Amino acid sequence: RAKVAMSHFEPHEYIRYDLLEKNIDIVRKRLNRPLTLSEKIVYGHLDDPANQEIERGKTYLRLRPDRVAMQDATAQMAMLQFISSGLPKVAVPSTIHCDHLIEAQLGGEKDLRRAKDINQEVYNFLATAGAKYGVGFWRPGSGIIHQIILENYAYPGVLLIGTDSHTPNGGGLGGICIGVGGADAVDVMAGIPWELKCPKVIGVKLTGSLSGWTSPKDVILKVAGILTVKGGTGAIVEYHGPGVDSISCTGMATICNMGAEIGATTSVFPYNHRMKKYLSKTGRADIANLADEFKDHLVPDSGCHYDQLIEINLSELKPHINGPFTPDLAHPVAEVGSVAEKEGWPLDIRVGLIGSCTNSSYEDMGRSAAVAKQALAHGLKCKSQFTITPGSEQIRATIERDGYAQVLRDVGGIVLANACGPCIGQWDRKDIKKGEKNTIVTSYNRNFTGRNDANPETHAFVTSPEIVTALAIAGTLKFNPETDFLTGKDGKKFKLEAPDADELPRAEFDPGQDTYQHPPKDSSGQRVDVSPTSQRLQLLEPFDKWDGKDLEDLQILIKVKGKCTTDHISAAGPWLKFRGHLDNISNNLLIGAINSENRKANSVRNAVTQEFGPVPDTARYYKQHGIRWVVIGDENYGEGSSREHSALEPRFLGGRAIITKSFARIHETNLKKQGLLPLTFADPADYNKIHPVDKLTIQGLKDFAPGKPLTCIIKHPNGTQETILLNHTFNETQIEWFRAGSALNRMKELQQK
Numbered sequence: 001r002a003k004v005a006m007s008h009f010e011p012h013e014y015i016r017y018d019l020l021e022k023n024i025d026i027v028r029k030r031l032n033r034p035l036t037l038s039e040k041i042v043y044g045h046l047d048d049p050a051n052q053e054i055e056r057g058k059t060y061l062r063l064r065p066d067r068v069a070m071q072d073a074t075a076q077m078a079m080l081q082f083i084s085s086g087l088p089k090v091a092v093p094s095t096i097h098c099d100h101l102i103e104a105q106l107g108g109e110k111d112l113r114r115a116k117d118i119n120q121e122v123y124n125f126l127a128t129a130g131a132k133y134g135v136g137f138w139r140p141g142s143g144i145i146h147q148i149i150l151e152n153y154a155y156p157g158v159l160l161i162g163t164d165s166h167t168p169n170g171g172g173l174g175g176i177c178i179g180v181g182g183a184d185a186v187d188v189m190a191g192i193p194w195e196l197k198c199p200k201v202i203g204v205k206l207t208g209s210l211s212g213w214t215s216p217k218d219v220i221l222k223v224a225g226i227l228t229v230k231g232g233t234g235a236i237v238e239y240h241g242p243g244v245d246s247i248s249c250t251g252m253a254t255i256c257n258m259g260a261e262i263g264a265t266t267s268v269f270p271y272n273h274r275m276k277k278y279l280s281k282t283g284r285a286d287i288a289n290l291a292d293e294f295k296d297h298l299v300p301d302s303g304c305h306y307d308q309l310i311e312i313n314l315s316e317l318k319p320h321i322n323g324p325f326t327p328d329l330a331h332p333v334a335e336v337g338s339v340a341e342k343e344g345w346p347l348d349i350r351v352g353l354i355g356s357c358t359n360s361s362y363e364d365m366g367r368s369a370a371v372a373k374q375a376l377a378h379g380l381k382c383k384s385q386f387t388i389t390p391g392s393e394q395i396r397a398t399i400e401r402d403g404y405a406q407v408l409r410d411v412g413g414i415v416l417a418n419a420c421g422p423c424i425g426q427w428d429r430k431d432i433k434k435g436e437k438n439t440i441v442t443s444y445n446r447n448f449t450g451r452n453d454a455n456p457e458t459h460a461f462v463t464s465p466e467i468v469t470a471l472a473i474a475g476t477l478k479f480n481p482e483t484d485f486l487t488g489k490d491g492k493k494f495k496l497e498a499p500d501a502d503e504l505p506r507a508e509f510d511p512g513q514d515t516y517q518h519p520p521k522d523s524s525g526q527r528v529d530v531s532p533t534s535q536r537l538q539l540l541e542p543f544d545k546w547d548g549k550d551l552e553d554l555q556i557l558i559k560v561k562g563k564c565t566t567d568h569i570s571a572a573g574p575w576l577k578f579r580g581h582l583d584n585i586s587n588n589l590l591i592g593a594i595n596s597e598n599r600k601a602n603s604v605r606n607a608v609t610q611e612f613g614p615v616p617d618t619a620r621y622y623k624q625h626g627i628r629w630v631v632i633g634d635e636n637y638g639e640g641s642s643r644e645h646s647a648l649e650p651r652f653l654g655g656r657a658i659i660t661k662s663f664a665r666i667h668e669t670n671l672k673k674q675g676l677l678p679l680t681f682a683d684p685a686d687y688n689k690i691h692p693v694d695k696l697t698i699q700g701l702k703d704f705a706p707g708k709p710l711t712c713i714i715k716h717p718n719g720t721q722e723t724i725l726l727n728h729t730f731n732e733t734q735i736e737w738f739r740a741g742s743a744l745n746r747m748k749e750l751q752q753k
């Protein structure tokens with residue numbers, strides 16, 4: 001047996017491709033059919049491969065992940081729940097990355113110094129709880145969670161879970177990396193099996209090769225346009241075909257990253273020589289050599305069956321730019337100017353923003369610098385404001401060293417700290433006023449309303465970093481880098497040629513400053529202090545167990561119209577200040593959702609006072625008076641970012657059930673984890689039978705069972721009653737979470753008490 005360590009920081013934790021192989025072989029003896037690559041890695045990690053029921057789309061798999069990664073906006077509540085479990089140490093390699101609480105304002109070093117003073121209490125809490133429980137800690141300034149994972153922790157065949165919806169990024173290195181809520185990370189840190197509904201597999205066969213201005217980002221901008229934001233739900237997207245070898249390993253991670261915007265469980269590429277190359281240049285040639293010996297297990301079987309196949313010819317793909325509003329409104333760059341003109345979207349670009357974990361590779365930075373040096377060679381600078389977010393300290397130190405950062409400063413860019421910043425709305429943006437209509441273009445991934453600056457009228461478009469750079473120099477959406485001319489300082493018209501740049505540094509990567517803090521797994525006599533008067537951190541009081549009774553005469557808090565993402569439910573931005581304080585963050589509950597009654601945000605009728613007011617204030621009034629309530633939603637409810645606060649906050653303010661036409665995956669799991677009932681209409685037209693004034697009784701909880709629907713009695717004010725049926729996806733493990741009041745309550749019953 002080979003003894004190759006999982007990373008440079010865990011020299012004693014070895015990669016177990018021997019167990020992966022053994023489990024794949026138990027499973028293919030049972031199934032007698034070819035396995036896709038995602039099937040090999042996922043079934044290769046089952047807790048019990050001989051007995052597990054495997055039906056794509058139907059069974060819940062009990063899995064053993066190799067490691068857990070958390071970022072600091074979700075690590076605080078995952079760790080406060082681990083502290084209530086009472087367990088002494090994490091069971092698997094786990095890390096915390098401090099990337100979400102650094103606000104962009106002054107640029108780089110100045111913003112990091114300010115964040116360290118402002119967020120002291122929280123960074124402290126996380127560093128101490130990390131030292132105490134055996135969790136590795138990447139300090140503020142070190143980089144964004146997915147770039148640090150790609151550079152240090154992802155490898156072919158890993159099963160990794162992360163408390164962030166863009167965890168799929170690590171699929172660019174052939175692993176299965178899945179986004180989860182904080183309570184799912186607590187299961188694995190605690191050592192119990194992790195459950196995942198068996199995925200469907202969408203295959204995307206790539207043919208030809210990219211060339212010119214077309215980059216890896218255009219592949220997933222095209223795929224998002226084809227599948228739409230609800231097309232990937234419950235499936236893994238598995239890229240394959242001869243065109244795969246023409247994409248860099250970091251380009252593969254860009255594509256897997258943005259698969260989060262079509263609702264996919266994750267995305268994955270097969271192990272090939274581009275990944276081998278990246279592993280060797282990031283100090284992990286021993287891992288590339290071991291994966292070469294287990295190569296058969298890290299590619300799909302011949303003839304495996306995909307549930308949907310899409311074919312993309314890379315040689316015909318053109319540059320794309322998606323938005324405004326939703327990531328699946330796809331346009332060629334060649335025609336977004338004309339469409340904008342037509343639709344009334346501002347053509348003048350105020351800000352061009354590149355980088356973040358989706359698009360800060362060395363190759364991305366080099367291609368953007370290659371565009372920028374052509375503008376500089378004609379005496380031009382950006383017309384738009386222009387920001388650059390490096391995804392890690394290693395990338396910042398290396399592009400600084402190889403000269404790209406200076407080219408990007410000379411065209412007018414400001415380099416921001418190695419942190420999410422504008423990508424999750426941590427941006428002190430003052431060039432526009434709130435409600436001023438304007439257009440920004442980014443090389444990020446989500447461009448939903450208010451995501452980047454909390455201004456509903458900002459039209460955000462997502463594209464590749466080299467296209468953001470060319471459009472920031474032109475200053476307008478009415479500019480096509482492939483066809484159009486700019487006028488230099490000197491009066492000559494010139495055309496931008498297609499950027500060419502190296503994939504990886506010729507020299508090695510410069511790691512930059514010391515940013516990792518290993519746990520004393522010696523010492524650990526750390527005491528975690530949470531002040532009882534902190535406004536930022538609060539220990540959890542357990543939720544009530546189920547009373548054994550049906551839910552009668554539930555009040556509707558709000559019937560939501562249309563789209564309701566986790567940012568409508570639990571907004572980010574300034575509310576990130578309270579991600580470790582459940583009572584204070586609950587003051588944002590559902591403030592962005594549209595009430596069907598009046599089509600306004602944050603204005604619902606209080607049933608007792610008959611005043612219209614804020615949703616959190618109304619939910620606290622109902623709670624205070626003993627009125628149990630419900631939310632009614634439309635399709636794909638809870639779409640988006642993974643924040644379990646979206647499920648914790650309604651449980652905390654007295655909600656009992658959320659009834660919708662359908663749920664996004666991570667949010668439905670988070671609702672079940674927190675003791676709420678996520679239920680869907682057995683007939684979606686019944687959404688129209690429920691009016692805001694109706695009261696509901698959910699009956700049948702005594703006989704709650706997998707596959708059996710619950711009965712809902714709609715009680716109309718005129719005395720009419722209508723019965724409808726509601727489906728649920730609970731298996732009996734999950735019904736036990738409901739009966740105990742939460743999954744954490746259940747686990748504590750199992751820990752002998």
Ligand code: SF4
Binds near residue numbers: 099164166419424444
């Ligand atoms: S907020 Fe943006 S930069 Fe931060 S982890 Fe998510 S995708 Fe990456």
Ligand SMILES: [O-]
Binds near residue numbers: 164165
């Ligand atoms: O994310």
